[PDB]
Symmetry: C3
């Protein structure tokens, strides 16, 4: 029962600074102490210095390819995260990665699935994060990691991302909480038959049924390891106001944590990302910590 808390203070996936402060804020909130109380032997893993990285992010406007912003810096930092997370998983430790914007998932998902090839990925997000290189409008790479992970628009992915192993398949990723999906993304999810449970489905079936369906969708044998990549903007701005891309109307605070409890309950969680905490906009950070505690086993009654 060992855990590595992977610190990924990266902001180059989106315009706003402050999200790179995520990891330190979560840790100051007592994240590591929380995990130890739940019985986890923890250690911290520093992938890079957030301030040095932020310096290059803020300065280097020339880091563009087409509409895509910072593909070089992002490719470098996410390869670092990949190597770290992969080693953690090979060591037999649980990789709990704290972001940082969601572009870091390019490294975390690649890292985990390289060790666990049949791992399912549950993407908890208001967004699909699957815009292609030529398809993206904002050019913000935190809205693109799944397209790169899936190898979509192959001929337009820059050489600096050549390091990304092709280990994720469309039938191994399930969305929960979608409500701001771009037109291009809509077509992609449809064409690729990706399991997508939007807010419509949560409203229609309830969060318990949705989580069950999401788990089943990425675990046919019912035995597969499961990874969750958790964007805090899935949770309605009423609870998560300090996040870069707030969307209504999202998960309640209750649904957001219940989701974690159902996942913890299934006992097959192998890795977790908690991303897009931007402290410069207590609630957002305490929600991040709460997600961690519930995911890693904290319950309301005796266990």
């Amino acid at each position: 029962k060992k855990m590595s808390i992977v610190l990924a203070p990266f902001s180059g996936g989106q315009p706003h600074s402050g999200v790179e402060l995520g990891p330190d804020y979560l840790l100051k909130q007592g994240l590591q102490q929380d995990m130890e109380k739940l019985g986890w032997d923890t250690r911290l893993e520093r992938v890079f210095d957030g301030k040095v990285v932020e310096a290059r992010k803020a300065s280097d406007n020339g880091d563009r390819i087409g509409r895509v912003k910072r593909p070089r810096l992002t490719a470098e930092c996410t390869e670092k995260i990949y190597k770290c997370v992969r080693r953690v998983a090979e060591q037999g430790r649980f990789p709990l990665t704290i972001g940082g914007d969601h572009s870091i998932a390019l490294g975390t998902v690649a890292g985990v699935l390289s060790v666990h090839p049949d791992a399912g990925v549950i993407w908890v997000d208001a967004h699909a994060d699957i815009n292609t290189m030529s398809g993206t409008v904002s050019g913000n790479l935190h809205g693109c990691p799944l397209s790169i992970l899936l190898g979509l628009d192959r001929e337009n992915i820059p050489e600096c991302f050549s390091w990304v192993p092709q280990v994720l398949k469309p039938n191994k990723i399930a969305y929960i909480g979608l409500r701001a999906v771009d037109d291009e993304e809509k077509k992609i999810l449809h064409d690729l038959n990706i399991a997508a449970f939007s807010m419509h489905h949560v409203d229609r079936y309830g969060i318990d049924k949705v989580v069950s369906m999401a788990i089943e969708a990425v675990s046919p044998k019912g035995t597969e390891p499961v990874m969750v990549s958790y964007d805090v903007d899935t949770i309605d701005p009423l609870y998560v106001p300090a996040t870069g891309t707030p969307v209504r109307g999202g998960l309640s605070f209750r649904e957001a944590l219940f989701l974690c409890e159902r996942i913890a309950e299934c006992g097959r969680l192998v890795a977790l990302d908690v991303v897009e905490c931007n402290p410069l906009l207590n609630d957002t950070i305490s929600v991040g910590c709460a997600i961690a505690r519930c995911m890693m086993g904290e319950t309301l009654l005796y266990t």
Copy 2:
């Protein structure tokens, strides 16, 4: 696939001014552009000038019969709306009427059912809007349109409302979202066996079951056209603060739009009212637009 956006800037059904600004605010928010994007060939229909009408509303205190306020002005303006909506439906266009207080529904429901006799009416509201002429306490006619439409308290309805066709029957109207029903209204709903799904039923069965039951209640053959008259005060003041008669605790923003999606889904929507937007109290107007988009086919994933 043609639509007429019927502008009904009327405020004479209730004391507060500002609700007559509804139509222009929704249009400035981009309502017409939204409908065109969804594939609708649209055009605007101006029934009357809201400023001229508001002038007579604010001045003419003598327009009273008993406790009922502005029965003459209301009867005149709603007859205009009736003739417009009826012609739109006869032209084979979808009447999307923007209010304006809910007294305009006297014209919209009469207009639609005169063309579609077997159309069901789903009344989304915190209130029953079915107080009679002699029964009303406030005397505000936006809380009375269904009594007139149903022909209740026949001997006490003023001659100026003689134009109203008797086309609505009690078994063709279903409420969703009730939580502030007057004692007299309670008795009426009971005595007439009107399908009424209060917040209790939403809490008990969930919004999906409630919407299903409401649709079934007004469509026995499962083939009948369906009209929705949507009062924005059904939605909890937390989401719709700028409305004349706010009531707790109502539909969530999510339930309010999910309702629209289920209706759009059934494919039998023939007309829609969006009423009681009072901008003088972004959320309320954007909610009004959102209701329209979801009702007319906008989905979270690919369609």
Copy 3:
């Protein structure tokens, strides 16, 4: 159909003053008038003077046994409440007790079950209120009444509580709404197999199923009288901000009142506490009144 509104202005169960103002605030809000409208012949019962009691509470810091605060004052005041509530029930009247912090339930539960031995108790609360004398950390007795009622940690309950009849058994108490349960309390609920429906269960099954399961848990014959002790902090601080121990994320305003309607519906409610209203922190007091009205029969539609 007779009711006694038992006024229990007690604050000695917790540090904060103001909760003793509960009863008067609820009454000024029109609590008694509300009950009369619902058909109840009401009368007020003053157990003690809240100002005189508050005077001794604020002054007497020496009233401690170990970590437990004010065991003497609490034992005295709750014995008074016990004798009052017991007499009310023997008179054949409905005891509706307004607090006051939740330590008053030591008197109300004892009073009711002494007259109705097979009565079930539904404890609506964010907390378990079952910390023992030696187990409590805060030493606040409003978090301890159920341990005393159940006779737990027998050898450490002060002599001043010797008056408490042992009438409550573990299989006759059901929780609804738990989300802040101490580690010691968790073990107790588990060891004693007490029916506990946390926010997890509300999230998982919905409030209707939870209330049904709670009623069944304390009423095997399906005939037993039912008592509800309602802590207003069960309701999310968004609706109940003026309460001493606010916890997220709790019941919605809708769930909180729906709960009351289901209970009223079963027709076996024999007594009700409404506690922990602390006006010095309109919403909180109006919620208290609303709980009362819904519990005692108020419905959204005709009845």
